[PDB]
Amino acid sequence: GAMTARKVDYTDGATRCIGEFHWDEGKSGPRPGVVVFPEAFGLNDHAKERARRLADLGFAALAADMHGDAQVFDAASLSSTIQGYYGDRAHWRRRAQAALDALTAQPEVDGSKVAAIGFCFGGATCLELARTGAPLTAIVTFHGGLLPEMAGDAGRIQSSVLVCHGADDPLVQDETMKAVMDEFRRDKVDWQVLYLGNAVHSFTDPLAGSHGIPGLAYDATAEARSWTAMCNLFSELFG
Amino acid sequence: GAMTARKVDYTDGATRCIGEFHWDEGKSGPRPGVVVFPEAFGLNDHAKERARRLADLGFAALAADMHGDAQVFDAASLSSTIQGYYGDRAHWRRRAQAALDALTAQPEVDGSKVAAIGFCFGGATCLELARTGAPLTAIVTFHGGLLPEMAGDAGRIQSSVLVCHGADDPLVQDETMKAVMDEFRRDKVDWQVLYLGNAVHSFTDPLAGSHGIPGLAYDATAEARSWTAMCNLFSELFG
Ligand SMILES: [Cl-]
Ligand SMILES: [Mg+2]
Ligand SMILES: [Mg+2]
């Protein structure tokens, strides 16, 4: 019947992280692995549920702890450490790589077949990680607040890229989306961008409206369609 | 085993059209109907194959004859017909509606569950037809050279809209895509736009390169992914 989950301790320098690894015990042997990067709030029920859903699709999934000590922040207390990441992208990248290493350390994971998904800040985190040249098959971002690349990033992405974007999301500027697409074009990345009408930021979270942060709202249609697009990409590229 | 096809005679004023209707004889009773609008060349093997593939998915599909007398043009001989449509959008719309009426006339079609897909000019045709307020559940455009709306079109689309766009297609301007998306936003249409990286115009046709028209090339990845997105939307909205 049910999927199983277990805590995974890992480190990034002096920071101790506690992720949660989801897999189907009913399935035997190595299988594709997915890192799930949460929203800025941190490792929360939303991210863990997405990892569970991935285990139910036949994957081994690690819900990542970016902040360390499984810390969760509310809207008020958040800028430390989110600005920490934007102001030091090398540090941000190492923290993401630590999660990918923790995934690949699990014996249920086929290390040759790994991907990453992420939500909001976690979506941005997927793209940062891909830009290091990590050996990812695919990344999928969900309402990710993507950044333009750093000098030296050109040509490094090895993964397929699917960006699922809320078409009315006020937190992501048109100019940024165009710049990122132009990077993908330049490098001939295997890329897609799916614009989801009537969707804003955090469209995948039924609690999106609970934070009192403007520009965040749930849209079940966008959640379903983006998840299906992700599922299709993984089925195409794995197995 | 195999799907079946039959010719369907219909008229738009003085113009006699000969479409081709595809269905599974193994399936009994009314089923969702799809009009397939071809590229500018006219009713050809490419369009008929897509109608066949739709019949294999459980739909009743009419490959439309826009030009009349099942006429096909090559790249050289094409403009007199095509400029005819762009210079008289009301006429273009009536010609499209005649195909939709011919579909709905077939006893295998559930008239309450109809959609339209189109390729290139046929994609543009789907959007023109939806702008009349036709009772379509969904339209899906594949490398469609979409036009901005006519004065008086606002609020009229009742269908879901999925636009599958080749991200490097030189025949469709960024400004046009942005304008169309802004119409969808304004009216709160149930819309998506899927940008397919590395794809140009006519990405769904393995013969795209055979016409000697610059900007046209096949991309099997884009063909597959756009077809899957279409199939998903139909499964979501029908049944
Ligand atoms: Cl669903
Ligand atoms: Mg490459
Ligand atoms: Mg509406």
Author numbering:
A (entry chain B), B (entry chain A): -1 to 237
Give me lines lifted from the publication on this model.
A microfluidic screening platform is used to recover and identify various hydrolases from metagenomic sources by screening for the hydrolysis of two substrates: sulfate monoesters, containing one of the most unreactive functional groups in biology, and phosphate triesters. The high sensitivity of our platform enabled us to isolate enzymes with strong and weak activities, including promiscuous side activities that have not been selected in the course of evolution and could not be predicted by sequence homology. (iii) One hit, P91, is a member of the α/β-hydrolase (α/β) superfamily related to dienelactone hydrolases (DLHs).
Members of this superfamily possess a catalytic triad41, whereas most bacterial PTEs described to date use catalytic divalent ions to activate a water nucleophile. The X-ray structure of the protein was determined at a resolution of 1.7 Å and structural alignment with a previously characterized DLH43 (also identified in the SSNs) confirmed an α/β hydrolase fold, and highlighted a homologous catalytic triad in the active site of P91 (C118, D167 and H199). Site-directed knockdown mutagenesis of C118, D167 and H199 led to enzyme inactivation, consistent with catalysis by the cysteine-based catalytic triad in P91, which was expected to provide nucleophilic and charge relay catalysis. We observed electron density consistent with two orientations of C118. Figure 5b highlights potential ‘protecting' residues (E37 and H141) that may play a role in stabilizing an inactive conformation of the nucleophile cysteine, as previously invoked. The lack of electron density in the vicinity of the active site supported the absence of a metal-binding site, underlining a role for the triad instead of a metal cofactor in catalysis. Functional tests further ruled out P91 as a metallo-enzyme: treatment of P91 with chelating agents did not affect its activity towards triester 2a, whereas a reduction (or complete abolition) of activity was observed in all other PTE hits tested. However, P91 is the first metal-free bacterial (or archaeal) triesterase to be described, unrelated to insect carboxylesterases. The comparison of the Michaelis–Menten parameters (kcat/KM and KM) of our triesterase hits with those of (i) OP hydrolases isolated from pesticide-contaminated soils and (ii) enzymes with known promiscuous triesterase activity suggests that paraoxon 2a (or parathion 2b with lower or similar catalytic rates measured) and, by extension, the synthetic triester 2d are not the physiological substrates of our hits. This conclusion was also supported by the experimental verification of higher activities in P83, P84, P90 and P91 towards lactone 8c, thioester 7 and ester 6, respectively.
